[PDB]
Structures are given as C-alpha cells and as structure tokens.
Amino acid sequence: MKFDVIIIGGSYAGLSAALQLGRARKNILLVDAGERRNRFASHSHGFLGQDGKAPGEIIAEARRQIERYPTIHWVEGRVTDAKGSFGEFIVEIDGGRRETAGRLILAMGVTDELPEIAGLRERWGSAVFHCPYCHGYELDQGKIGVIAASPMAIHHALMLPDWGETTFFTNGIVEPDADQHALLAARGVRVETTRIREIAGHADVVLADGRSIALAGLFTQPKLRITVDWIEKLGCAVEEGPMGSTIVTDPMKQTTARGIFACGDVARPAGSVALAVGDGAMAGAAAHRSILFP
Amino acid sequence: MKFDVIIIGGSYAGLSAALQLGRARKNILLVDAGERRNRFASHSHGFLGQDGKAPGEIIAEARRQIERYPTIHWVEGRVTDAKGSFGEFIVEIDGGRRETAGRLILAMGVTDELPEIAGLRERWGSAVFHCPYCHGYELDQGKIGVIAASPMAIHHALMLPDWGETTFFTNGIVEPDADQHALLAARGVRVETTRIREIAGHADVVLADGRSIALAGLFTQPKLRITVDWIEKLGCAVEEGPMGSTIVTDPMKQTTARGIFACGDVARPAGSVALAVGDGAMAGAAAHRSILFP
Ligand SMILES: Cc1cc2nc3c(=O)[nH]c(=O)nc-3n(C[C@H](O)[C@H](O)[C@H](O)COP(=O)(O)OP(=O)(O)OC[C@H]3O[C@@H](n4cnc5c(N)ncnc54)[C@H](O)[C@@H]3O)c2cc1C
C-alpha cells in the first residue's frame, strides 16, 4: 500500500533518516541494494562513538536498533526507476515490484571513478584512499603519496604533510605555477613530475623512468558518479563538475523537486559518516514536516 | 605552551571536533565543565548506533576512543574569559590558569530557560521535554500535553498528534486565529485555554479552574541561553530572538570572527546529538584548514 515516505538507499544517511521517521511512527519503506562506498575499507574512523569500528558493524548495529520500529519497512533490492510528483511517486524495484509514496528521500551514495593506473583499483580501500582524516592516521607518519587526478590536486597535496612525508605525483595532470611551486616547497612536499606506470607491492609507485617509490599509503581524488538513470525524470537539479555529480539541496535537505529530499554523499561531494548521519537526520525530520505542513 | 586550537566545550560537538584534529595530529586543548544539556534524561534517542543508550555512556565511550590521540589535550574546567584575535587568542580557566591558541572552537551548548510553572523544572528530562523525536516515542501513544511558552507554540502543538492524543495548553500565551483554530481541530488537537497552576504527579497538569489533566508526558519550548559573558569580547555575531541566542556561523562553521568556529547547540537553535556530531566534525576540519591555508 502507499507509503508516507520511500527512502532509496539504506546505509548511514538513509538509516538515520528512517530512525527519525520511525520514531514519528510514519509508514516508510527503506529500499537498499547493500553496496556501500566504504565496503573496501577494514575500519571506519572519525565518527564519534565508532572510531575504529568495522564499517559493516556500525551498520549492523544501527539496523538492529532501527528494526525495533514497526512502522519502518525494509526491502533489499535496487530501485531501477522512480517517477511521479508530490504526493504520488512511483518506484520500481529490481525491474519488477512497484511501490508508491507521497514523499521520497534519496540516500543512494556515490560511486568512485578512479584514475586509470594499473594496480590502483585493486588497492582501493586498503593502500589507496581519498580522505586523509579517514585513513591517514594509521599510516603512522610514514611516507605518503598523493596522485593528481583532478583540478583540486594541489589543494589535496598541501593537506597531506600533516600526516607524513608527502610526495605529490603530478602524473601529467597538473603543472603548478610559481606560487604553487613555492608553497609546495615551504610545506615540505616532494613534487614528482615523472609519469606513473603502475602501483605495485603494498603502495609502491613505479614511475615511467624505471624508479619505484615505496610508500606506506596513497591518496587520490575520485570522480563521484550517481549510478541511477532516473534522477532527471524525478526532476531534481544536479550539480555536475569535474569532480562529479551531487544532487542540489537546500539547508533543510529538500531538492529542487517538491516532496523529494536528499542526504549523504549523494548530496554532499566531500562527505563522511558523521555528515551522512547528520544530514539523514535532517532529511527525515524535513520529510516528516512536509507531511505535517504540506 | 601555545595550542593550535582550544575547543571550549567537550560534549558531542566539541569531542567530534577534537577527533578530527587529533587524527590530523594538531596540538589542541579541550576545556570542558561537564554539564551537558541532556544530563536530565535517562536515555538518548535518535542518533544512529546509539538509539537507547544512556547519554553519559555515549560520552564515556567517545572519550575512551578520543583519549588514544596524544595530540589531543584535556582540562576539566570552565572558561571564564577569552579574548584576542586570529593567531593569538587567550583563554582564562576557572578565573586562574591561562592558555593561548591560534584558533578557537566554541562548543559550549546552551542552557534551557523554562516557563515559570510550579513543578515543571523538577520534572525536566523525566516527564517534561522539548523535542518530540527525542522523547515522544516512549510515551507509547498515550496522552500528551504541549504547553505554550513561545511565538512558535502552535507549530509545536501541531507536531505532537503524530505521537499521541495531544492537548495544547495555551496558558494565556497565545490565542490562535480562525485559521489556526481550524487547523488544530482538523489535526485532532484539544486546545485548553485555562491557565496552568502547577505540574503535579508524573505529568498531571493542574489547571487554575480546579481540573487536573493526567498526561503521560509534557512538551514545551525552552528559551536558549549561552552562559558565558565573553562572546562579545571575541567579536562573534550572535543571533538574538524570542527563543534565545545562537552564534552566527557560515556553512563551514566559521563565526563572523576570523579564526573562531562554533558547533553544536551553541550554533544551531534546534540541535540534536546527530547534528552536534556532524557540525563538530565540520568545525574541526575547518579549523584545520584555517591553519593549513591561513
Ligand atoms: C575507501 C573509503 C573509506 C572511507 N572511510 C571513511 C571513514 O573511515 N570514515 C568516514 O567517516 N568516512 C569514510 N568514507 C566515506 C563513507 O563511505 C561515506 O561518507 C558514507 O558511506 C556515505 O553514506 P551514504 O549513506 O551516503 O552512502 P553509502 O554508504 O555509500 O550507501 C549507499 C547505499 O545506497 C544503496 N543504493 C544505491 N543506489 C541504490 C538504488 N538505486 N536502490 C537501492 N539502493 C541503492 C547502496 O547499495 C548503499 O547500500 C570512506 C570512503 C571510502 C571510499
């Protein structure tokens, strides 16, 4: 039957949304495909109360708690289509199954598209990362590499000295100007301009000139993709730039489409678990308020 | 010696800030007086992973985790004065002890000023609350009261029907207009206009006419106070309205004063633990970035 809210995506953001709506006893459906952005990492860091915990265990415990609310409904599955408008949205699940709802919350996360460097992808989440707060500390102030992939490369490079002795591999992507050259030096960054052939060993960068640089870990900047083809038909504006796509939201997490809210990495290009949880909580309350004061 | 950052307040917001800065290995001092806004409640609700946990236990566990970072420093104490400007702030603790820092994070929370109704204060956090998401569910759809204290009274009243059978006590504070009268009725709110004499029993409202209304719990809207006298000397703009004070911040949690960030209920008038944690995480990263790119 017609749900009050369908939440598309059931990880940190979508669960945090569900929790608020279940405590308000609203009739909601969480639909989740179970492929979370941090599945590649062994331990989560930086989220208060859970620093060090396995990312899947944080989820498992959140779920045990959220399942105690009988108005929260759950389907494991993937939304293959969604359409309609305020008060009458229609969602298709696994190309079969169809459900309807008066409001939608989009909490799908993003997928990371990485530079095309042999060896890099296999190492994602174990020796190659994107977020220094997330995974820099445990490199124990060893040698750290930063691979340019994006316009922002130099900014990311200037951050990593606070975590170890940093080498910035421009990889033909970026050529710093005199002021950038001067700043990289003062901040103690080694700038390596030789192209990268592959990542080998734990996090050894093999350069095109034959040299190999042994590092404790590597960071680069992924391009973020939203992996559904139906956002346009719902009518939400999406911000599209060199580092990927983000659903536009206001400070209350409403998208440009009435009745549709978004939260988590799908709506924040530099997200974290702490922020997904915060933004999901806001999105659940805002959707509730849209039902109370329509 | 001179800290990179002093964080004033060490509960959810300030700890979440500290966690990010400790993982960046910045030299910071947390100063905390240990009197948290939710100390009056037995269990916390609505924060992913911790739904149901005692509020003090969430803190205790966060602290065990955050104490493993050797660059995070801790003093138990109250900041009695703070002054200075970017790169040279001076903090006085317990009117003695003086510490200096290049940046400040304000994470002091707020104090709740309640209506002057006999019996109400003694019941705060046990049978009288402010936040329906926080404490409505466990009233188990019993009878619920909402006491007008503020301009927003009618909005708060219109929310509570989703939690139980609601009586709105206008208490001489507010007189709804025809449209409000009509909405309260359609939403199933009982409007009680008789003045309140006292709160008795668990949550029995004794009215001025001699009637007593037995309720499972009560909600009202507290006026929020910031209980330091030195914000003005630091130079931060503060928003002052009928429901209290909030430090002004931008979306990166910087106050109008360079080098000073704010997070948690001190910078959000409708806060929660989830939002304090999110906003603290942002504030810690932003302060770090202000040290990296000054
Ligand atoms: C390698 C790595 C390590 C990280 N480590 C940390 C860390 O230590 N600490 C930290 O704070 N942050 C870390 N992050 C970031 C963290 O992963 C994200 O901030 C967080 O996962 C975002 O939560 P989310 O709910 O928005 O998205 P996700 O966790 O990514 O969840 C999205 C969910 O929605 C589902 N979904 C997507 N589309 C559909 C659909 N069409 N229908 C149904 N379901 C769908 C997915 O299957 C998934 O289960 C890390 C990121 C990476 C890549």
Ligand SMILES: Cc1cc2nc3c(=O)[nH]c(=O)nc-3n(C[C@H](O)[C@H](O)[C@H](O)COP(=O)(O)OP(=O)(O)OC[C@H]3O[C@@H](n4cnc5c(N)ncnc54)[C@H](O)[C@@H]3O)c2cc1C
């Ligand atoms: C009764 C009640 C129940 C609540 N229940 C929930 C709930 O279930 N779930 C939920 O999400 N939210 C709940 N809330 C809200 C929750 O309490 C706040 O959102 C949260 O505490 C805010 O965190 P904070 O860090 O900003 O402030 P606080 O937790 O209030 O912490 C402020 C800290 O700073 C310290 N401090 C202040 N001034 C100074 C100073 N000058 N020098 C040094 N230290 C100082 C204080 O002593 C304190 O330790 C509830 C609120 C109330 C009143």
Ligand SMILES: [Mg+2]
């Ligand atoms: Mg990462």
Ligand SMILES: [Mg+2]
């Ligand atoms: Mg409360």
